[PDB]
């Protein structure tokens, strides 16, 4: 079955909004979809335990009815690097557990989207990064580019490191994090030339709750 890892040019650039758009497009195409956020930091207390908003968005945008822990096995309250809060709470983040969770979703879904945390090299322990896990799993990567000053450099750095790891950069998504600026079209043209993967679509600036907006229409899944 189809599996994709979604990374971003940084944290706070649109990975989650773009991931919901991708999931909606896959559902429209007839797939049995599932979103997976194996590691999440920055979560709120509920009667059932900690709940992360990215994980909730991926759960709500899956075509299948999935239990929260299946979408997000590792949940930390504080919004910092996973390795830091993991060490402080004495809750190791294990590659094998993250992989087992992906296999469990593949039991019922034929199209799985995995959202990373932060950018490409976010640490999970003092000797293991998210990039190490993606490399182990050999997942094709989708790059979410938050369109803003400095995004060209971040997109190029990320694309180069992914290719060096021997991984496939399956495509990129342009996310309009702010209202239209002066050099928007020139930035889009530059990003299109420089990123060695197909532009899958552009998500417009949607001020109010973009995670629940009908955004699947902005993704062309036939390019993926």
Ligand X SMILES: C[C@H](N)[C@@H](CCCCCC(=O)O)NC(=O)OP(=O)(O)O
Ligand Y SMILES: Nc1ncnc2c1ncn2[C@@H]1O[C@H](COP(=O)(O)OP(=O)(O)O)[C@@H](O)[C@H]1O
Residue selected from 3, 4, 17, 25 as contacting ligand Y according to rule CB under 6 A: 17
Query: If binding is defined by CB under 8 A, does position 43 make contact with its own copies?
Result: no
* Set 2, 27, 37, 45: catalytic member: 37
> Using the rule CB under 6 A, is 123 a contact of ligand Y?
no
| Binding at 95: pick from its own copies, Mg ion, ligand Y, none (beta carbon under 5-8 Å per type) | none
DSSP state of 129: B
List the structure tokens of 163.
């290719």
Q: Which residues of 9-28 are buried (b: 16+ CB within 10 A; e: fewer)?
A: bbbebbbbbbbbbbbbbbbe
Task: At 209, list the tokens.
Answer: 């709750």
Q: Does 3 bind ligand X (CB under 6 A)?
A: no
Check if 217 is active-site. no
Q: Is 53 in the site for ligand X (CB under 6 A)?
A: no
Is residue 126 near its own copies by the rule CB under 8 A?
A: yes
The reply, when asked if residue 115 is annotated as ligand binding, is yes
User: Which residue, 118 or 216, is less far from ligand X as judged by CB?
Assistant: 118
188 binds, among its own copies, ligand X, ligand Y, none (CB under 5 to 8 A by kind): none
Q: Which of 19, 24, 21, 50 is nearest to 37 (CA)?
A: 19
Among 30, 92, 150, 204, binds its own copies (CB under 8 A): 150
DSSP 30-64: T--EEEE--EEESEEEETTEEEEHHHHHHHHTSSS
CA max distance for the chain: 49
- Which residues touch 91 (CB under 8 Å, ≥6 apart)? 74, 76
* Per CB under 6 A, 75 contacts ligand X: no
Site stretch for ligand Y (CB under 6 A), options 30-38, 42-50, 164-172, 203-211: 203-211
- Report yes or no: 7 and 155 within 8 Å, Cβ to Cβ: no
Identify which of residues 2 and 184 has a Cβ nearer to its own copies in the complex.
Answer: 184
Query: According to the annotation, is 41 in a ligand binding site?
Result: yes
Among 39-47, 60-68, 126-134, 205-213, the segment contacting ligand Y (CB under 6 A): 205-213
Whether residue 48 contacts residue 68, with contact meaning beta carbons closer than 8 Å, is answered with yes
Annotated binding site: 12-17, 41, 54, 115-118, 175-176, 187, 204-206, 211
Catalytic residues: 37
């Amino acid at each position: 079955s189809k599996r994709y890892f979604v990374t971003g040019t940084d944290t706070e650039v649109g990975k989650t909004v773009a991931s919901c758009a991708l999931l909606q497009a896959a559902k429209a195409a007839g797939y049995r979809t599932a979103g997976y956020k194996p590691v999440a930091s920055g979560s709120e207390k509920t009667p059932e335990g900690l709940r992360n908003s990215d994980a909730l968005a991926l759960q709500r945008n899956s075509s299948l009815q999935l239990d929260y822990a299946t979408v997000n096995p590792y949940t930390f309250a504080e919004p910092t690097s996973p390795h830091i809060i993991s060490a402080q709470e004495g809750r190791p983040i294990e590659s094998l557990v993250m992989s087992a969770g992906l296999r469990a979703l593949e039991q019922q879904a034929d199209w799985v989207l995995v959202e990373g945390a932060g950018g490409w090299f976010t640490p999970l322990s003092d000797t293991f990064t998210f990039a190490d896990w993606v490399t182990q799993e050999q997942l094709p990567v989708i790059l979410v580019v938050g369109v803003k000053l400095g995004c060209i450099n971040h997109a190029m750095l990320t694309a180069q490191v992914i290719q060096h790891a021997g991984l496939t950069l399956a495509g990129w998504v342009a996310n309009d994090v702010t209202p239209p600026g002066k050099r928007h079209a020139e930035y889009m043209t530059t990003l299109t030339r420089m990123i060695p993967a197909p532009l899958l679509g552009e998500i417009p600036w949607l001020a109010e709750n973009p995670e629940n907006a009908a955004t699947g229409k902005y993704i062309n899944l036939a390019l993926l």
